Amino acid sequence: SNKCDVVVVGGGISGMAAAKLLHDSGLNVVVLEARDRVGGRTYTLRNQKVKYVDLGGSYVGPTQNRILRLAKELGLETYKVNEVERLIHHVKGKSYPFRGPFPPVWNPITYLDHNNFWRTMDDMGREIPSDAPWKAPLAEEWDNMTMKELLDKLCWTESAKQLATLFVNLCVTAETHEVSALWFLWYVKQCGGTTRIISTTNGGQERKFVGGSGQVSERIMDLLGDRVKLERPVIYIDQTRENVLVETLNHEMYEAKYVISAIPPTLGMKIHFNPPLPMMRNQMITRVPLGSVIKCIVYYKEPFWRKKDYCGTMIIDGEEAPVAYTLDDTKPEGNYAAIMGFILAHKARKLARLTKEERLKKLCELYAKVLGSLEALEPVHYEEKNWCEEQYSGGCYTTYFPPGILTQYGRVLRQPVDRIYFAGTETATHWSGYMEGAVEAGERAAREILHAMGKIPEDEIWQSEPESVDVPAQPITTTFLERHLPSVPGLLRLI
Amino acid sequence: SNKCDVVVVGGGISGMAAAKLLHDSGLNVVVLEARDRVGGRTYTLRNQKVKYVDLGGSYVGPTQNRILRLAKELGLETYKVNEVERLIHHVKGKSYPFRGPFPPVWNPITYLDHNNFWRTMDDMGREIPSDAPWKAPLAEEWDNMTMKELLDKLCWTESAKQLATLFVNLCVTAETHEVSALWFLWYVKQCGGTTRIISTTNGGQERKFVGGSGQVSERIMDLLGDRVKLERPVIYIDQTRENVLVETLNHEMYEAKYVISAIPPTLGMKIHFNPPLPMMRNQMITRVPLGSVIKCIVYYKEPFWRKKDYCGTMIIDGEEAPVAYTLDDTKPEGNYAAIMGFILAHKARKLARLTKEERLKKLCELYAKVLGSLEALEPVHYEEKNWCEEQYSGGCYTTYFPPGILTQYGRVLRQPVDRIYFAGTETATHWSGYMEGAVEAGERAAREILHAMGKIPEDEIWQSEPESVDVPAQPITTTFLERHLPSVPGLLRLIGLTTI
Ligand SMILES: *Cc1cc2c(cc1C)nc1c(=O)[nH]c(=O)nc-1n2C[C@H](O)[C@H](O)[C@H](O)COP(=O)(O)OP(=O)(O)OC[C@H]1O[C@@H](n2cnc3c(N)ncnc32)[C@H](O)[C@@H]1O
Ligand SMILES: *Cc1cc2c(cc1C)nc1c(=O)[nH]c(=O)nc-1n2C[C@H](O)[C@H](O)[C@H](O)COP(=O)(O)OP(=O)(O)OC[C@H]1O[C@@H](n2cnc3c(N)ncnc32)[C@H](O)[C@@H]1O
Ligand SMILES: c1ccc2c(c1)[IH]c1ccccc1-2
Ligand SMILES: c1ccc2c(c1)[IH]c1ccccc1-2
């Protein structure tokens, strides 16, 4: 058997971050990665036509200080997602160009409804502990409702409901009826709230890595060399003995003092445990699916939308549109002009049955309508990735919690099981579901093990992160009117 | 590599029924069973104190003809669960003895609400195809709501809502808020409806197997001999070559023309697939958890409840009661007096913290109050099984579908993946979640492979089952009043129109 201090299961960002921290501490780490590549839910494809493209996780932003610090240490640079020109909200078959993070509404009733919806999500969020959403004072009430129910309750307008729906679909690549209100509200609040999560400028979509996010995992793999074992899917973990035994599908045996599980919680199901997992984890890892998304990048000779003062961001309401949300994916040099769009939630399932060429045509025709340009009909290249297909991801971006699960099982997610500690973005308390959360969880799990080894004190397991100098956070602000305008039922009570 | 025609993954009733059918058709079958035993979610414990006790699936009933036929063929007999004396509905700290399948109410408004709740469950069920619940006209609308939301819409009394909630908890060992309304309405409909599923006499809980339901799998294992491989958890299935390769955790390799997956759908995750599963299945097997239950059996010197004219059936409403439902589990001979109780859904999680001795005390104190009997405080023995703990079950009784899942993923539950066919009770179209469904699905998967091999025509894949002559099904009947009494909103609509 191959003997080491710690086996890290999964060479995604979380696993790689944990392995790098343990390696840097002088421990012998081995990273066992199921795939023939590192990066997991990050994947950067290189070819002459795109140079490079992120087909998985890509965007980083302010307050994601851990992924920015790790990336900078590995010699990576960020550039800003193009948000110079106008965003588009495409509503009832018409493009409404706008500026700012939130699509505007003109109907005064609809305005109150929209304002109240975003405000209420953050108000509810403020009662949900980041590290313990199940401790929210109304945790049971909110966990026992879907986002669909909450939105049906809150939204007096079809307009607000459709945008809130799009927002849920885009945040968590799931339907409003699929997810716990408590979990969703937690999810938003632990990314710093509605503005932070939805924003390009000053939000989660501000930046991308020059040369692609896959370089974070690739360059930690560069550092660790042969400590990374590719095509080593872990099938079995045995903690009955002095040392933990980790077995891979190619029959290899790894012996460690401790294990970090840096895989999506539900992919814990692909590992056979001895002894059995405790009851609550045994059931938890069956209750926590990942969302559904196809990431699609259409390439053009030029970023022709910029000529019409569109930045390439499109928010596209309604069932018919295959893509509800797009960003400009042009390279910082202004070449390899491209529009990135997500086919979200049920549409990922619906449109997966088409050919690549058919999806390209649907995307091109949608983009020609929304951008109002025939140039959208003349793609020079197309790249796409359906994350629903991935045995070793389960989906993207992340794990959602259906109604009732977070309150009953949420405490389990990072509870050590003897000498197995849990990393993975799902176990983060901030930007859980992001590359940031991956780094937070990997490093926290690694330091749980350093604490178990008597190498660090309890108070050093959870470590704050200095703010990035390259990507500083600007405060999230609201207006007096946004804070105090009445809800639609608020305005009715008054009449 | 160990070569055969069909590898069956899982030695529950479904995989055993599949293996038996294929074996009986002249094929070379292997059953790869993860545990040191067969039976899966069925498990008959034997010791001197209890003689035998089903800690898992136990009850069979009218319309469950496939399990009755399979059991009978294996030499098993059934007996009737005790329903001679009064059932108890325990609501708000008081016991109300009654007779008949549904706890009665006297309050006329409450009467219309209860009547309408049960009627509406079945009315909605009649819209849902057993084999394609996603084809219900309102499939999307019903699949996008929880049972909590549907009860909130339907129940105009707290009384009906509390009984309805208990009904859901008891039926699918899940909270009303955890489960799809479409799926739950399908689930009840595919068991023959509210009366059939809830009833002891003339329903799902009418009978038990003499000696325990574990005998079904054990006796099929005896028939198959060494073809059943215990402690062979499957870890890897490879379909990239001419023959399917199935690898187990101990590194044994099996080579087959075809595979039957007879494991709960989500436990499909414990297998690494080459090539990868198609997208829809890849995601479906992460979206379908099993419910949560502790089955608890408290033993007494005598079935002392019978002397107070109580059959041992207690429907116990509300949060404090660890157990919401009990049946007399006394042996047919009248000895090893016992009360079987379920600790359901969240209470299974909540009370698993306690010691066995502490759960026993809580159950006795409950039974003492519900039965008005100090004798309930004098148990002689106790057995329990928390199914939440089982790596190779995931829970009990069965897989539930959270909102949105059944319409998006439902269609691939039993869709073959190249040379893998899917059995297990979850893939049944009648009494899915039950031993009956396990038999239906195992046999159907087996016949799919027989069809793929050109051994039978397509029209023999799905086979009807002759009605058991031993457990005849009384039809489910409604009275004129039951069909036409207005809902509470129907009564209110009538009152509106009279005053006009
Ligand atoms: C897919 C996706 C993700 C994504 C997103 C868009 C798409 C289409 N956009 C994002 C974004 O713009 N910014 C961001 O921060 N995140 C975005 N996401 C999410 C992001 O990619 C993930 O949160 C992050 O990559 C998660 O990292 P983590 O390290 O937690 O998880 P992982 O990448 O899934 O890595 C797990 C690795 O484990 C291997 N694996 C799985 N099972 C096994 C077994 N049994 N044995 C060994 N290895 C295993 C996986 O192969 C993977 O490499
Ligand atoms: C647990 C339970 C179930 C139950 C119930 C009460 C409880 C507490 N009450 C019931 C009742 O009164 N009447 C009834 O008809 N059903 C009742 N249920 C449900 C019933 O037990 C189940 O529907 C039924 O037994 C399911 O049979 P099925 O054959 O579909 O599935 P299974 O029993 O889970 O068997 C699966 C087998 O597969 C093995 N396994 C799992 N993973 C693997 C891998 N990777 N490799 C190989 N084998 C695997 C399991 O060990 C199991 O044996
Ligand atoms: C709200 C709004 C937009 C996004 C998100 C949440 I996760 C993300 C990743 C890439 C593009 C866009 C998003
Ligand atoms: C409704 C009512 C009662 C039951 C069921 C559904 I699954 C069954 C198995 C054992 C006891 C009770 C039940």
DSSP bridge partners of B88: B97, B314
Q: What is the DSSP string of A461-474?
A: SS---PPPSSSPPP
* Distance from Cα B135 to the centre of ligand 4, integer Å: 27
Domain extent at residue B22: 1-40+62-77+210-288+402-462
Element (H, E) at A279: helix A279-284
Report the side by side order of strands in the sheet with A2-3: A2-3, A253-256, A244-248, A234-238, A272-274
Answer yes or no: are the C-beta atoms of A118 and A483 closer than 8 Å.
Answer: no
Q: Is A365 helix (H, G, I), strand (E, B) or coil?
A: helix
CB contact under 8 A, B279 and A388: yes
Do residues B88 and B192 share a domain?
Answer: no
Report if residue A425 sits inside a domain. yes
Ligand in closest contact with the CA of A426: 1
B54 C-alpha to ligand 2 centroid (Å):
12
Q: Which ligand is nearest to the CA of A427?
A: 1
Q: Which residues of B259-290 are buried (b: 16+ CB within 10 A; e: fewer)?
A: bbbbbbbbbbbbbbbeeebbbbbbbbbbbbbb
Is there an atom of ligand 4 within 6 Å of B340 CB? Answer: no
Tokens of A318: 């309604």
> A53 CB less than 6 Å from ligand 1?
no
- Using alpha carbons, select from A185, A412, A191, A169 the residue that is nearest to residue A291: A169
Which 3 state secondary structure label does DSSP give A244?
strand
Q: Is A456 exposed, middle or buried (0-12, 13-18, 19+ CB in 10 A)?
A: middle
In a domain, B33, yes or no: yes
3-state secondary structure of B78: strand
Q: Which residue of A has its CA nearest to B405?
A: A178
Question: Least CA distance to B281: which residue of chain A?
Answer: A389
In a shared domain, residues B420 and B283: yes
- Bridge partners, residue B248, by sequence: B234
Question: Residue A77: left (phi > 0), alpha (psi -120 to 50), or beta?
Answer: beta
Query: Could you tell me the resolution of this structure in angstroms?
Result: 1.8
For residue B443, is it within any domain?
yes
Question: Residues B7-30, buried b or exposed e (16+ Cβ, 10 A)?
Answer: bbbbbbbbbbbbbbbbbebebebb
Cβ contact A148–B144 (<8 Å):
yes
Method in brief: X-ray
Whole-number Å distance between alpha carbons of A32 and A248: 8
CB pairs under 8 A between A and B: 141
B420 plus B372 within the same structural domain: no
- Same-domain check for residues A386 and A263: no
Contact (Cβ atoms closer than 8 angstroms) between residue A324 and residue A162: no
d(CA B116, CA B161): 12
After which residues is the backbone of chain A broken at C–N > 2.5 Å?
none
B247 to chain A, minimum CA–CA distance in Å? 10
C-alpha B346 – ligand 4 centre gap (Å): 17
DSSP characters over B290-359: B--EEEEEEE-SS-GGGGGTEEEEEEE-SSS-S-SEEEE---TTS-S-EEEEEEETHHHHHHTTS-HHHH
Contact A362, A322 (CB under 8 A): yes
CATH number assigned to the domain comprising residue A457 = 3.50.50.60
Closest CA–CA distance from residue B325 to any residue of chain A (Å): 22
- Could you tell me whether strands A381-386 and A293-299 are parallel, antiparallel, or unpaired per DSSP bridges? antiparallel
Q: Nearest Cα to A13, choosing from A64, A79, A81, A82?
A: A64
Q: Which of A235, A273, A403 sits opposite B235 (nearest CB)?
A: A235
Same domain for B346 and B203: yes
Q: Which of B284, B154, B217 is nearest to B438 (CA)?
A: B217
- Phi-psi domain of A173 (left: phi exceeds 0; alpha: psi -120 through 50; beta: other): left
SS3 A87: strand
Expressed in angstroms and rounded, the spacing between residue A50 Cα and the centre of ligand 3 is: 22
Asked whether A450 and A261 are in contact (CB, 8 A), the reply is no
Among the candidates A198, A218, A234, a domain finishes at A198
Kindly state whether residue B477 falls inside one of the protein's structural domains.
no
d(CA B407, CA B404): 6
If asked whether residues A204 and A331 sit together in one domain, one would say yes
Domain boundary among A141, A165, A198: A198
Is residue A1 in a domain? yes
Counting the structural domains of chain B, the total is 3
Beta-carbon separation of A404 and B175 below 8 A: yes
Q: Which one of A161, A253, A283, A409 would you mutate to disrupt binding with B, by most B Cβ within 10 Å of its Cβ? A: A283
Cα of B200 vs centre of ligand 4, distance in Å, is 8
To the nearest whole Å, the CA of A287 is away from the closest chain B CA by: 6
SS3 A255: strand
Q: Residue A277: which of B178, B282, B391 has the nearest Cβ?
A: B391
> Are both A393 and A328 inside the same structural domain?
yes
Compute, in degrees rounded to 10, the torsion defined by CA atoms A165, A169, A171, A173: 160
Q: Is B343 close to ligand 2, i.e. is its CB under 6 Å away?
A: no
CATH number of the domain that A152 lies in?
1.10.405.10
- Measured from the Cβ of residue A309, the count of other Cβ atoms closer than 10 Å reads 10
CB-defined site of ligand 3, < 6 Å = A 59, 170-171, 197-198, 204-205, 325, 327
> Which is nearest to B175 in space by CA: A451, A408, A431?
A408
DSSP run (H or E) holding B167: helix B158-172
Ligand nearest to the CA of B170: 4
For the Cβ of B264 lying below 6 angstroms from any atom of ligand 2, the answer is yes
Name the residue among B144, B146, B386 with its Cβ closest to that of A279. Answer: B386
Residues A306 and A412 in one domain: no
For residue A473, tell me if it sits in a domain.
no
Shared domain for B277 and B303, answered yes or no, is: no
The label of the residue with tokens 């002759």 reads: B466
Write the CB contacts of B22 (distance below 8 Å, at least 6 apart in sequence): B5, B6, B8, B29, B260, B446, B449, B450
Is there a cis peptide before residue B397, judged by omega within 30 degrees of 0?
Answer: yes
* Same-domain status, A203 and A320: yes
**At B274, which helix (H) or strand (E)?**
strand B272-274
What's the CATH number where B333 sits?
3.90.660.10
DSSP 3-state assignment of B231? Answer: coil
Omega before A97 within 30 of 0, i.e. cis: no
Contact, A426 vs A399, CB < 8 A?
yes
Partner-chain contact A403 B403, CB within 8 Å: yes
- Tell whether ligand 2 has an atom less than 6 A from the beta carbon of residue B263: yes
Q: Is residue B475 included in any domain, yes or no?
A: no
Question: Could you tell me which chain B residue has the CA closest to the CA of A409?
Answer: B349
The answer to whether residues B98 and B116 belong to one domain is no
Shortest alpha-carbon distance between residue A339 and chain B (Å): 25
- Asked if the bond preceding B275 is cis, omega within 30° of 0, the reply is yes
Which token pair is A398? 């992340």
CA distance A427 to chain B (A): 18
Chain B CA closest to residue A405: B178
Question: Which one of B146, B240, B415 makes the best mutation probe of the A interface by having the most chain A beta carbons within 10 Å?
Answer: B146
DSSP state of A268: G
Asked if residue B284 and residue B145 are part of one domain, the reply reads no
Ligand showing the shortest atom-to-Cα distance for residue B192: 4
